[PDB]
Design an enzyme around this catalytic site. Sequence first.
Site, short mmCIF file in Angstrom:
data_model
loop_
_atom_site.label_atom_id
_atom_site.label_comp_id
_atom_site.label_asym_id
_atom_site.label_seq_id
_atom_site.Cartn_x
_atom_site.Cartn_y
_atom_site.Cartn_z
N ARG A 3 83.37 -48.66 0.98
CA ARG A 3 82.92 -48.95 -0.56
C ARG A 3 83.97 -48.80 -1.51
NH1 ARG A 3 79.65 -46.22 -4.49
NH2 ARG A 3 79.31 -44.39 -3.20
N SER A 4 84.40 -50.07 -1.91
CA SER A 4 85.30 -50.19 -2.90
C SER A 4 84.81 -50.62 -4.14
CB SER A 4 86.56 -51.01 -2.18
OG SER A 4 87.53 -51.01 -3.29
N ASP A 5 84.36 -49.95 -4.86
CA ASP A 5 83.75 -50.16 -6.19
C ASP A 5 84.18 -49.29 -7.41
OD1 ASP A 5 80.52 -48.79 -5.63
OD2 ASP A 5 82.47 -47.78 -5.56
N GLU A 6 85.40 -48.61 -7.49
CA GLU A 6 86.02 -47.76 -8.28
C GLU A 6 87.45 -48.19 -8.76
OE1 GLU A 6 83.26 -43.78 -7.66
OE2 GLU A 6 84.96 -44.02 -8.94
N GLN A 19 84.50 -46.09 12.96
CA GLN A 19 83.49 -45.66 14.07
C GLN A 19 82.19 -45.24 13.08
OE1 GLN A 19 84.83 -43.08 16.94
NE2 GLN A 19 86.58 -44.25 17.28
N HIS A 70 88.81 -40.06 1.76
CA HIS A 70 88.10 -40.25 0.41
C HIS A 70 89.46 -40.53 -0.29
CE1 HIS A 70 86.33 -40.26 -3.37
NE2 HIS A 70 85.18 -40.49 -2.77
N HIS A 80 83.71 -40.88 14.73
CA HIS A 80 82.63 -40.80 14.56
C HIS A 80 82.29 -39.76 13.30
CE1 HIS A 80 81.79 -43.16 18.25
NE2 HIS A 80 82.41 -41.89 18.64
N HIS A 84 85.67 -44.23 0.58
CA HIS A 84 85.33 -44.51 -0.93
C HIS A 84 86.64 -43.73 -1.77
CE1 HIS A 84 82.93 -44.06 -4.94
NE2 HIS A 84 82.77 -45.16 -4.40
N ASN A 111 88.81 -49.78 21.65
CA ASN A 111 88.12 -50.46 20.38
C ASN A 111 88.52 -51.95 20.23
OD1 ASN A 111 86.15 -48.72 18.59
ND2 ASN A 111 87.56 -47.38 19.50
N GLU A 131 88.01 -43.14 -9.37
CA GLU A 131 88.26 -44.05 -10.05
C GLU A 131 89.91 -44.13 -10.20
OE1 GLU A 131 86.39 -44.00 -13.80
OE2 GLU A 131 87.03 -45.68 -14.52
ZN LIG Z 1 83.44 -41.20 -3.72
ZN LIG Z 2 82.96 -42.02 20.68
#
Ligand SMILES: [Zn+2]
Ligand SMILES: [Zn+2]
Lengths: 205, 205, 205
Positions: B51-54, B67, B114, B109, B73, B194, B76
């Site tokens: 989520r890149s919203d700041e 994963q 951040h 996982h 995130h 992967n 700001e």
């Molecule tokens: Zn955050």
């Molecule tokens: Zn695994």
Amino acid sequence: SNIRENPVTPWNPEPSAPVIDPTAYIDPQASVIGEVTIGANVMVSPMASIRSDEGMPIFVGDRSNVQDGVVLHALETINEEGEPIEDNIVEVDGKEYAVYIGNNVSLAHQSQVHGPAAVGDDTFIGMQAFVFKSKVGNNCVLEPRSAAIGVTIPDGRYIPAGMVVTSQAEADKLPEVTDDYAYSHTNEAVVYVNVHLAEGYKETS
Amino acid sequence: SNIRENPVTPWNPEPSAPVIDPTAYIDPQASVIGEVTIGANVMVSPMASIRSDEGMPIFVGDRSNVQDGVVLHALETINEEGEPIEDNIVEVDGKEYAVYIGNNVSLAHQSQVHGPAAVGDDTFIGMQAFVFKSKVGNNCVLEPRSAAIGVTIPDGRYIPAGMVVTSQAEADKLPEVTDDYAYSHTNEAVVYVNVHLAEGYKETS
Amino acid sequence: SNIRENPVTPWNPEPSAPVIDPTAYIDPQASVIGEVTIGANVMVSPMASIRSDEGMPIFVGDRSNVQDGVVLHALETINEEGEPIEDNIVEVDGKEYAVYIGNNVSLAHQSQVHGPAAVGDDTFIGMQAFVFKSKVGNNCVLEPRSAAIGVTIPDGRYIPAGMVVTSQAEADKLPEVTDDYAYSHTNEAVVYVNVHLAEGYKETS
Ligand SMILES: [Zn+2]
Ligand SMILES: [Zn+2]
Ligand SMILES: [Zn+2]
């Protein structure tokens, strides 16, 4: 739908649907189930799960935020014989809750607040933190990876990163938030951002 | 759609949509929002939230993996007055990012990176681990449940399981990855798997 | 669909679909992929990810529960040359698994069990806990935020909250569950509740 009623069970004769303020934003990839009240200007992010299916309400106050992957759930508050389990209910301002989250509270990414629990106003619950069977006061900071289990955290205290607090004697001696403390202004910034994100996301729906 | 633009806010005049290499696989139950670049052969698993919203980009390099339940995130990077907040921006090879994930990186996982944060090439970020306000070097291993907050982790070091590193003095004395170390070959194996999973899942879409 | 086959890869010539008992409830916002067997009366909650895409079965026994945000996944059990990797396979009652979860097991919110791993009957895996490369016995309790990595946990032991157990010498000296222990009856209560939730949610689908 991702906003759903809880099911009929022996402790829940009547299904309840969430009560959500029209100014709140619930992401389509969040889940909100059952007897939940969500206040004004709340942002609920992707992958959050707010699940009230074991009796009693989960309440999320005004201008709070529930970030990605956060879980809110609670232990049973009413047994099969209709008897309220008082150990699993918190009281706040004369009303009973399974989980109470106050106003201007940030529940940061991957944290969890499990009932019985109350979190007071203007508190930051940091990334990956955990609260269970605890009352966290107002103006507190739980740093990332901290936890409070079975304790009352006094107003204006913080828990350092990684610390797991399980005894009241520990909780009583936690350090105080001061202006020079690194997370002293974090919650106000995060609340400001999230109230604005909620409005922006609402304009895309 | 689970791949979405970020919203208009006071720090984001213009919405951005993710830039995703055609060879990447994004699971339908992942969420990818905003100013994000995803490289070649990347696998993004169920319940991940990027989520890149700041403000500022979140970058995920080639042959990396994100994963199940991982969150990316960032704080700001641009305030309301248009001024860049330099403390919350990392620089890598002359370019600025909120979160930079290099090439051949595994975010295992339930981990979380951040911003501000950078993770160098060929690094394993273990299950449930946490990185925030840190630069992690190349060829590092964060064992499960480890964390790096506010530090620079030198190249070729590991953090033992459960350790929370918050001071540079600690980070400087972390042990080195050697051939006999238990996780010395883990990342190469996970990357190989992967890259092949991404191709197989693409053949089912 | 959220219940899906695994992909064709060099270690998986033939896709497998999950085998799910008709009395189990899989939430629409959970993900279940690949070679997975789910037993009777199992409840799988929102945001859980059960992903069997690296060879060998993930098994979840009767009357167990997989709560919100839980991840089950496993290391590769068959290499590209068709050779079984015995270190990454657990044996239970004469059969081989990547992950074995027994009967009446609770995997509480945000926990993770990563193969190779086995969890015996009537065990509570607490909130945010982690199990990897371990065998956990019957009638055990992993308190919230505990972890077992590389060890065998004897029957009837508990791991205190926040403790990360990585050596067999530690595991051998863990305390015993007794009637006066705080979590001694937790699993039975949680199993009872979740079997009833599964039936109630099935009646809404
Ligand atoms: Zn955050
Ligand atoms: Zn695994
Ligand atoms: Zn619960």
